[PDB]
Ligand binder design. Structure first.
Ligand code: HEM
Ligand code: HEM
Ligand code: 8F7
Ligand code: 8F7
Ligand code: H4B
Ligand code: H4B
Ligand code: ZN
Lengths: 411, 410
């Protein structure tokens, strides 16, 4: 069964066959769509089918499907599974797995770059300190003095679920958030809870509006430990506006490296619970969400005020006006400092080209419209008029509960 | 299976049970979500009756006479007429209920907080295009109300054998013409290029201006459709000017005040109203973001930004964005100045969240298509963006239907 998607701007129609190779479920049914819902201990019983499926994919990709190399590997993995209840990936497989996980990430507008991922194998890691070291090197390598590089670092796979490696931070680099007694928040409101945990674990908070948080690292199921990323590793960009001289005085800055660390990499049934990955920012991530979202730095008011906008009725679109300027300034600041950033126009255009290419060479490209469309100026980007099929392919990045809700504390 | 929806800006969590009353299909499966797909032979006597019963069961529930004398009788009454006439007719009250609830159930509509204040015009006695023209003129005049817009739907006779369909061939009652130019591109309104042709190709004399109000093309009882010109005094238009940029009026833009959609099919109790033009009032972005700035439309961003002397060299200056905002500031300012009803995308989305909360509270849910509820600009700074929404199809409903010229036994 074949499926068509249409771009209503350009009348380009594409045909998806890839969706047939889909395994996992969407949350949707015939009678309900959960397409806008944010979120919708594994035995050998179901592991080898997952392994075989991955290995079949892998050897297809290297044009060795059915080869003796393919069959022995299957045999080898089989034997290792029933013998050890799990199995290990070769380096080639791990790299393939991680790259395809990204490629399969249907909510990611950035997947044009997916084949150019730097994979760091941290599967020999055994301690938090070792994790800290691997992560430091990730950051230094990925940051590259502002010339950002995609990278992922992969810590040991889950075994019995009782010896998990986890990075407790949601991102490697993020600013603290402090609930004040008067109800106001100092720093990033998105990070208040994690900040508290860190503090409780013994972090000494400078309590400034832009304190880089400590890494909280958990190895082999042990209680997590605190580490401070060396500040010379944390590339930061002061935020100024090209026409508005008063913008710098808003005292804003942001870090250059977006590196997500709370997700789970699944490859051939194996679960990599600590697998931090990084790329570079689309400007709107910082400029729309990180600053202007009501539950974040929320500087919309202050910028509006300083622009002397009509902030009385909303129909003055003062919010819209400030939002643009703030995103103008974010892009301006980063480019001025030669730190890699992409604007939402460029990123969405690239994605459409990626997607079309993917339909031609791969038979489809799973995509989550709700997430792919930029959080501002949606319809003047070409993804807005792009119909998209959303389905779940493995290898995949998955969500997982915050470790502090599941962790058993040693003490 | 009593699903929850979270608002992530507010942690408000609503419980949805209404979805279990759903009947029709979404297009999705557990293997693939189609929620971004634009759109995924009459009724036999057999499948028509449960359809009627389902609708009548809701109706009498809503008037708290479920399982009552009145209910049972009417149920029996409709049942008899179906078996006999192979169809049936709605009581006026059921018609009104049906239409209002088709709007209530329209999961893509952000304006549904107003749903129960719909003015319903029963045009089921209509027999000719001239008749349709008259009913449509009265609709347009009533809805416009000198700029104090009012919601209305006018309902023409229900489908019979599919050979006698009532159809308004226009997509909206009021839309500007679109002309293919020898120079290459398009004058007027590009979305309406083919229709503007069909009109001419059916005998219309185009003024070939940029804002030529299209003629009505009405089809009664499945006959050759007919051209009618809407009296200009009934077509309220707003000249578009900017509150701070006096050069903006020189762009020579205007829009019409009445959004009135005329190509959809209203389904009630299994009956199919293929002609049922309905209208409300605009959210500002519908004109400013979409009608002006979409590339397959007026596409005026470029020249607007030029007059703003913005750096259009690289996309990263966000000149498109900047212009887009000014254009939309202008539209609102213009309409508001001329006392024509209009809502900004902040106001409408806020309204919708309240409406959502209301529907979960008094009805147990509210079907919603996030892809369509989120405005085409400033998405994440409107409240709907962080609002999880469940999408499912309830009846009565508005549905799509083929463009008539692809079907019509001419
Ligand atoms: C290199 C440039 C990249 C850009 C510009 C980019 C951009 C984005 C954006 C804007 C989102 C939406 C999230 C949000 O707005 O909150 C997203 C989602 C995502 N990205 Fe990318 N990304 C990049 C690289 C990567 C890399 C290297 C990986 C993994 C190795 C990745 C994996 C993902 C995943 C798994 C999601 C889904 C998030 C979720 O499900 O919650 N991305 N990306
Ligand atoms: C009164 C103020 C109203 C406002 C502000 C409003 C707003 C909107 C908007 C913004 C859309 C999205 C379409 C787009 O942006 O391209 C929409 C869709 C829709 N509206 Fe409403 N609307 C209103 C009244 C009504 C009324 C009176 C009806 C019918 C009785 C109605 C039925 C619908 C339907 C069926 C759709 C989706 C049609 C489809 O699936 O394509 N609306 N509306
Ligand atoms: C404003 N939304 C905040 C947010 C929420 C979730 C969730 N759930 C997940 C994320 C992270 C999604 C993500 C993951 C990876 C990214 C990479 C590698 C690069 C980039 N520029 N953005 C990303 C964005 C953010
Ligand atoms: C430019 N948006 C694309 C679009 C496509 C189709 C189709 N096919 C149909 C529609 C109609 C959507 C609609 C329907 C009714 C509306 C009413 C009654 C009021 C209003 N302000 N907007 C509407 C908008 C839109
Ligand atoms: C391809 C995509 O689904 C299509 O462009 C939809 C997206 N969301 C929309 N949302 C609204 N309000 N109006 C639209 O026309 C559309 N078009
Ligand atoms: C409810 C909704 O799914 C949620 O707010 C999503 C919507 N789309 C998004 N899109 C992006 N890029 N990032 C997000 O965080 C979200 N949040
Ligand atoms: Zn779906």
């Amino acid at each position: 069964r074949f499926l068509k998607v249409k771009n209503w701007e350009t009348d380009v129609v594409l045909t998806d066959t890839l969706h047939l190779k889909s395994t996992l479920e969407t949350g949707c049914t015939e009678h309900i769509c959960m397409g806008s819902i944010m979120l919708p201990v594994r035995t050998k019983d179901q592991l080898f089918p997952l392994a075989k499926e991955f290995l079949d994919q892998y050897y297809s990709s290297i044009k060795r499907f059915g080869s003796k190399a393919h069959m022995d590997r299957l045999e080898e993995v089989n034997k290792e599974i029933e013998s050890t209840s799990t199995y290990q990936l070769k380096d080639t497989e791990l790299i393939y797995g991680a790259k395809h996980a990204w490629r399969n990430a249907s909510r990611c507008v950035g997947r044009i770059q997916w084949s150019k991922l730097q994979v760091f194998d941290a599967r020999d890691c055994t301690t938090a300190h070792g994790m800290f070291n691997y992560i430091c090197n990730h950051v230094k390598y990925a940051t590259n003095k502002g010339n950002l590089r995609s990278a992922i670092t992969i810590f040991p796979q889950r075994t019995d679920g009782k010896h998990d490696f986890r990075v407790w931070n949601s991102q490697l680099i993020r600013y603290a958030g402090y609930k004040q007694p008067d109800g106001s928040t100092l720093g990033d409101p998105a990070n208040v809870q994690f900040t508290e945990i860190c503090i409780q674990q013994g972090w000494k908070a400078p309590r400034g509006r832009f304190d880089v948080l400590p890494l909280l690292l958990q190895a082999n199921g042990n209680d997590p430990e605190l580490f401070q990323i060396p500040p010379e590793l944390v590339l930061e960009v002061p935020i100024r506006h090209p026409k508005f001289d008063w913008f710098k005085d808003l005292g804003l800055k942001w870090y250059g490296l977006p590196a997500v660390s709370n997700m789970l990499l699944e490859i051939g049934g194996l679960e990599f619970s600590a697998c931090p990955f990084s790329g570079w920012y689309m400007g709107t991530e910082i400029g729309v969400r990180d600053y202007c979202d009501n539950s974040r730095y929320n500087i919309l008011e202050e910028v509006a005020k300083k622009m002397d906008l009509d902030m009385r009725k909303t129909s003055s679109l003062w919010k819209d006006q400030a939002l643009v300027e703030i995103n103008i300034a974010v892009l301006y600041s980063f480019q001025s400092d030669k730190v890699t950033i992409v604007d939402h126009h460029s990123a969405t255009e690239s994605f459409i080209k990626h997607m079309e290419n993917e339909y031609r060479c791969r038979g489809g490209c799973p995509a989550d419209w709700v997430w792919i469309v930029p959080p501002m100026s949606g319809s003047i980007t070409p993804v807005f008029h792009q119909e998209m099929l959303n389905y779940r392919l493995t290898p995949s990045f998955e969500y997982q509960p915050d470790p502090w809700n599941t962790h058993v504390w040693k003490g």
